[PDB]
């Protein structure tokens, strides 16, 4: 039996653990919390940690644990199961990316079509979109989008986009609220993440929704994907079962369990999502370094400077 420190949505972690317990008869205990807190906890606990595996919604969390000497190596055959082009790889082969969440533009297809969409996420912050684009500045993925713009295009561009959103956009408290505002006609488009929309479609039926998604693709900064993953702790004295679990998460079965539970993109090429997601490779995500705590502080500074 193993202990998994879990920064992922509880429904995802519960599903894969259950599927694993059913496939192997090995029991999984979840300890759930915020990935950054769990990573600090793993650092402080050190050799004495009870965690066998760290399962996170954000692979960026692994860099600091790897450099601290806290992660075990995983099988290269396992790493290769999800190593599609563009998927982040651990240089020390001591964690693996398993699934992804995408930035997207949601639009009311009763008012707009693809003719009205933009080639670049930058172009939504422009006067064409005054009072017509919703955004969620408090959102973690909004903050990852800002980090990506800084990285890909520089701070001037990033700041200018934020000022453009201040001037032209409608601020919503959360992604679900933005999505509802588009469905309800308050605003004709909004910047959100994919799974909100696919959750609502699965639940209500797409034919009954007024909104649709637009993917910018071509490695635009607005095609940003955030990656979930897993690592074995070097401190574990149950390496065999920890390793068996991380192998399971990369298996067809483990990926199928995840995608049934949550509308994340599987990183195995032979798994479909019942949420009707496109294949990961079609997203054309840009390649962006992992977010650091310094990157996040910097992005928060730009958001403040833009009056947001
Ligand atoms: Fe959430
Ligand atoms: Fe949310
Ligand atoms: Fe969210």
From Swiss-Prot:
Belongs to the bacterial solute-binding protein 1 family. Part of the ABC transporter complex FbpABC (TC 3.A.1.10.1) involved in Fe(3+) ions import. This protein specifically binds Fe(3+) and is involved in its transmembrane transport. One of its GO terms (molecular function) is metal ion binding. Changing residue 14 to V: In strain: PAK12085 and SB33. Its main location: periplasm. Gene3D superfamilies: Periplasmic binding protein-like II (3.40.190.10). Induction: By iron deprivation. GO terms for biological process: iron ion transport; transmembrane transport. The complex is composed of two ATP-binding proteins (FbpC), two transmembrane proteins (FbpB) and a solute-binding protein (FbpA). The keyword Signal applies. It is found in: Periplasm. The keyword Transmembrane does not apply. InterPro entries: Ferric-bd, SBP, SBP_1_CS. Keywords: Ion transport, Iron, Iron transport, Metal-binding, Periplasm, Signal, Transport. Transmembrane segments: none annotated. The lineage of its organism: Bacteria, Pseudomonadati, Pseudomonadota, Gammaproteobacteria, Pasteurellales. One of its GO terms (cellular component) is periplasmic space. CDD domains: PBP2_Fbp. Fe cation binds at residues 9, 57, 195-196. PANTHER family: IRON-UTILIZATION PERIPLASMIC PROTEIN, THIAMINE-BINDING PERIPLASMIC PROTEIN-RELATED. Pfam families: SBP_bac_1 (PF01547). This is Iron-utilization periplasmic protein.
């Amino acid at each position: 039996d193993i202990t998994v420190y879990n920064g992922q949505h509880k429904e995802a972690a519960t599903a894969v653990a259950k599927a694993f317990e059913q496939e192997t008869g090995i029991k999984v205990t979840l300890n759930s919390g915020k990935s950054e807190q769990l990573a600090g906890q793993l650092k402080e606990e050190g050799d004495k940690t009870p965690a066998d595996v760290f399962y996170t919604e954000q692979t960026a969390t692994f860099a600091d644990l790897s450099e601290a000497g806290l992660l075990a190596p995983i099988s290269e055959q396992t790493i290769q199961q999800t190593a599609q082009k563009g998927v982040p790889l651990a240089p020390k082969k001591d964690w693996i990316a398993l699934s992804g969440r995408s930035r997207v533009v949601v639009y009311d297809h009763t008012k707009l079509s693809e003719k009205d969409m933009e080639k670049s996420v930058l172009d939504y912050a422009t006067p064409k979109w005054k009072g017509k684009i919703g955004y969620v500045s408090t959102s973690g993925a909004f903050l990852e989008q800002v980090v990506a713009l800084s990285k890909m295009k520089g701070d001037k561009v990033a700041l200018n986009w934020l000022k453009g959103l201040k001037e032209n956009g409608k601020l919503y408290a959360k992604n679900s609220v933005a999505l509802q505002a588009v469905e309800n006609g308050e605003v004709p488009a909004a910047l959100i993440n994919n799974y909100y929309w696919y959750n609502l479609a699965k639940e209500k039926g797409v034919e009954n929704l007024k909104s649709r998604l637009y993917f910018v693709r071509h490695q635009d900064p607005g095609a940003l994907v955030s990656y979930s993953g897993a690592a074995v702790l070097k401190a574990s004295k149950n390496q065999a079962e920890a390793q068996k679990f991380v192998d399971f998460l990369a298996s067809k079965k483990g990926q199928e369990a995840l995608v049934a539970a949550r509308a994340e993109y599987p990183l195995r090429a032979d798994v479909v999502s019942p949420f009707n997601l496109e294949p990961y490779e079609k997203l054309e995500a840009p390649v962006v370094s992992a977010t650091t705590a310094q990157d996040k502080e910097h992005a928060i500074k730009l958001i403040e400077e833009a009056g947001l």
